[PDB]
Design a binder for this molecule. Sequence first.
Ligand code: O6A
Ligand code: SAM
Ligand code: MG
Ligand code: MG
Ligand code: ZN
Ligand code: ZN
Ligand code: ZN
Length: 423
Amino acid sequence: PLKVEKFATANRGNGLRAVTPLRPGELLFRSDPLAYTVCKGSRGVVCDRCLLGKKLMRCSQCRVAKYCSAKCQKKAWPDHKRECKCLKSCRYPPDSVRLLGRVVFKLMDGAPSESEKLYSFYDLESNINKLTEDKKEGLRQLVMTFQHFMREEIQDASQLPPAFDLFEAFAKVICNSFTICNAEMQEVGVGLYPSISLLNHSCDPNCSIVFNGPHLLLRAVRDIEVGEELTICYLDMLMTSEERRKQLRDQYCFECDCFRCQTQDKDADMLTGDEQVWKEVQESLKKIEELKAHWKWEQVLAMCQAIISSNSERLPDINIYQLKVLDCAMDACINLGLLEEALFYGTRTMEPYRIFFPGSHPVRGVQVMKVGKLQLHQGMFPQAMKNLRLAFDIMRVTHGREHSLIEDLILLLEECDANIRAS
Ligand SMILES: NCc1ccc(S(=O)(=O)N2CCC(NC(=O)c3cc(C4CC4)on3)CC2)cc1
Ligand SMILES: C[S@@+](CC[C@H](N)C(=O)[O-])C[C@H]1O[C@@H](n2cnc3c(N)ncnc32)[C@H](O)[C@@H]1O
Ligand SMILES: [Mg+2]
Ligand SMILES: [Mg+2]
Ligand SMILES: [Zn+2]
Ligand SMILES: [Zn+2]
Ligand SMILES: [Zn+2]
């Protein structure tokens, strides 16, 4: 019996609303993707199928798809078989083109997907009548890129779903793509989850999604009344209202009416410090984030240290650009085994994260868990326990028992508690 239902909103198209009262942490829907792929930077770093990092085995035919195990390579074959001949034949396509290829193959060759239970690819919003000419030109180039990439497998409309229009399909992709994140909150893939696509956006949402490999869990993060619309935040929380406005216009074709956008909620705190410094850090973050997307941790760390410990002027840790640098440095340190330095950066992020991730947000839950884990392994048992319990309080809501990371957290809590009891 579903706790959610599709409905027609007054001014935001279709949406999802609660059928029953919902409490924080309640699992509302779970879904595998209709189609998904690894993102360009994680290609060859994580398994194409399960999206875990490993030391990967490549598909011998295309040598593009890479896998953690024979199980994953073999299980991925039915959904990889047709794209394999295309990847071989061609130059690597934009993620959206690889994704749409997988959409087409799934719709043509696969049984009806549970991911389409509430809403299908065919139903998705295209926003075509809101696209500006520059966006239409970009979509036309994507169409032509798809036609080139897919030519070994799709030569005519007979090989697309009935009356499938590639321009419209890419228009849907742009406003319906989910960024799949691994357990550590590294972006690793992109997917379409058409039932989940019913959720409209809020900058202060009542639900949240989290990924466990390709699998998506939708949970309430506030109390929700019968009939109330369910929302998620499509965006990183570490964004000003101007940045949100740009992304919601450019990618989603809407103007956000939430209270936060009307009042520039938190913008001024997010932009504290000297503007010339944070403008330079924001510019450096383009390169830092590009390096991070490719798992280049040593280079990430070097760039971050040059900011965090700059000889030149510095930023407060609440400035969002400084905060993003701290977080990249922490993750680089964790992945590099520099656990004392990781804890220094991670600890600094804790109060800004408390402010910018109000309520229960999976990114804060994960960050607090990382900090608690670092403290636990440094023997700081009471401090680790407070953070691990805080992470559990958040992650019971945002992740829940169905997400494997919660089991890892429970292990840390038991280890930490055992230490405290032996002290
Ligand atoms: N610095 C890395 C980072 C990792 C994780 C997050 S997150 O967990 O907060 N989060 C991921 C999911 C994303 N949302 C989507 O991709 C998305 C797409 C849509 C609908 C289909 C348009 O709804 N959510 C919104 C940000 C933020 C930054
Ligand atoms: C993932 S879909 C959400 C479901 C969509 N309303 C539909 O009818 O299919 C994203 C699109 O929904 C609309 N949208 C989402 N959140 C909105 C909001 N807060 N205000 C207005 N439109 C919104 C925009 O058209 C956006 O591109
Ligand atoms: Mg429509
Ligand atoms: Mg419309
Ligand atoms: Zn795998
Ligand atoms: Zn292959
Ligand atoms: Zn808003």
